[PDB]
């Protein structure tokens, strides 16, 4: 159909500055700086009133106008990451063998170590992506918490931790052992 | 559809200008059963029209043409509000409406309003039922051939929803940590709305 104009709004809170060169977005907020390259989407950014950015697609097809809302969501998540942050809480689930999760250093790289998963003698190592902070949560049993500006990096770290603990050669409906994302929210409460 | 809506609006008209003392009551969290009970109590005293905010609002705005007195009602038509029309004594009708406060039991995954505790008393349920206490880590022992909680234990706490097991044991031992009932917020009467009482 080639819709003439499609537009999306990106609200910018007070403490956030968005610098948009051709398609390189730099969002700066209280929690830090996030950067994203969007030169693969062919959209147009325009600053309206220093609190609102419009992103537009001109003469766009269905896939193009869907990518427009995808871009709006990506930039909104960048702004959310620099204002509130992103935190994923994962639970260790096991029937018999307690999963031992720790933080170790290998040439200054901050791996997450998983031992005794389903009794395996193998040691699973998941590198911590830069910008992601790991905290083992008290007051809740067997909880790991991943916090950071980029929801992409936080969720990818959580996904790596979850996928490294997949059960092989067993009925996974019965062997539910693993490390599963239990909650996805923001670092700052109720913001 | 439009036919039924027009019928509803006509019923609204007659209810309004025959039963001036209507009660804007809050049906939020009120069960259908409790509604039926309170209605049966007020039978022959108070009719309870309980349509959707939007249609009631539009209808009363239209009726303003002949009965402008009801404009103040419109800003109050928000949330789950039901108009209990009547003319019988205000105090008595309101008391019957807002006196039944049924103890709502622990439905699964229901937000806990307080720090509900389970008490070191002889519950009396059959030995078999000890499984729930075991699952919830409730310290108990069979006394007089029945389950008896040895020590006080907080089962649920403020915040976290009441998980299926939590709710199951709570319902089993009859702790009902909720309370639902017809809650009047305002009362229009003799062409005047005012605080619920």
């Amino acid at each position: 159909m080639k819709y003439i104009q499609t537009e999306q709004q990106i609200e910018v809170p007070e403490g956030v500055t968005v610098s948009i060169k051709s398609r390189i977005v730099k969002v700066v907020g209280p929690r830090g700086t996030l950067t994203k390259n969007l030169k693969h989407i062919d959209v147009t950014f325009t600053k309206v009133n220093n609190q609102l950015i419009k992103v537009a697609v001109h003469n766009g097809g269905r896939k193009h106008v869907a990518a427009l809302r995808t871009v709006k969501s990506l930039v909104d998540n960048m702004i959310t990451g620099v204002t509130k942050g992103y935190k994923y809480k994962m639970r260790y689930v096991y029937a018999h063998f307690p999963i031992n999760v720790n933080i170790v250093e290998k040439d200054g790289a901050k791996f997450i170590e998983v031992r005794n998963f389903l009794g395996d003698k193998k040691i699973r190592n998941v590198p911590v992506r830069d910008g992601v902070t790991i905290e083992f949560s008290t007051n809740v049993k067997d909880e790991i918490v991943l916090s950071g500006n980029s929801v992409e990096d936080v969720s990818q770290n959580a996904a790596d931790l979850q996928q490294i603990c997949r059960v092989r050669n067993k009925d996974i409906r019965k062997f539910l052992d693993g490390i599963y994302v239990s909650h996805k929210g923001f670092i700052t409460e109720d913001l | 559809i439009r036919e039924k809506k027009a019928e509803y609006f006509a019923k609204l008209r007659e209810y309004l200008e025959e039963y001036k003392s209507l009660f804007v009551v809050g049906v939020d969290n009120v069960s259908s059963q409790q509604m039926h009970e309170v209605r049966k109590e007020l039978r022959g005293r108070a009719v309870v029209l309980m349509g959707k905010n939007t249609m009631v609002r539009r209808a009363i705005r239209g009726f303003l043409s002949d009965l402008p007195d009801f404009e103040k009602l419109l800003p109050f038509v928000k949330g789950n509000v039901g108009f209990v029309f009547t003319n019988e004594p205000l105090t008595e009708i309101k008391n019957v409406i807002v006196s039944n406060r049924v103890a709502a039991p622990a439905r699964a995954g229901a937000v806990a309003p307080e720090d509900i505790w389970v008490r070191a008393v002889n519950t009396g349920m059959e030995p078999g039922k000890t499984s729930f206490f075991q699952a919830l880590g409730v310290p108990t022992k069979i006394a007089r051939g029945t389950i008896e909680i040895v020590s006080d234990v907080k089962v649920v706490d403020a915040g976290n929803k009441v998980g299926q097991s939590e709710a199951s044991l709570l319902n089993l031992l009859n702790i009902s940590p909720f309370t639902f009932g017809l809650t009047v917020v305002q009362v229009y009467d003799n062409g005047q709305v005012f605080p619920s009482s």
Binding site: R91, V93, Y94, A95, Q162, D171, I172, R173, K174, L176, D177, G178, Y180, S182 | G163, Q164, S165
Partner: protein, 52 residues
């Protein structure tokens, strides 16, 4: 044993899924079409069989 809440959490990822009848792909529980190209994105999906 696994406590009910953690068991339900694990089941959300292991058991509460759809399966394509043509290509057996593990699909989201609310999916209407398969995501795989081999099966032609068919709408022939079933719930993943529950243990016991």
């Amino acid at each position: 044993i696994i406590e009910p809440s953690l068991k339900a959490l694990a089941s959300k990822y292991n058991c509460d899924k759809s399966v394509c009848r043509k290509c057996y792909a593990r699909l989201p529980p609310r999916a209407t079409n398969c995501r795989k190209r081999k099966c032609g994105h068919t709408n022939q999906l079933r719930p993943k069989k529950k243990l016991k």
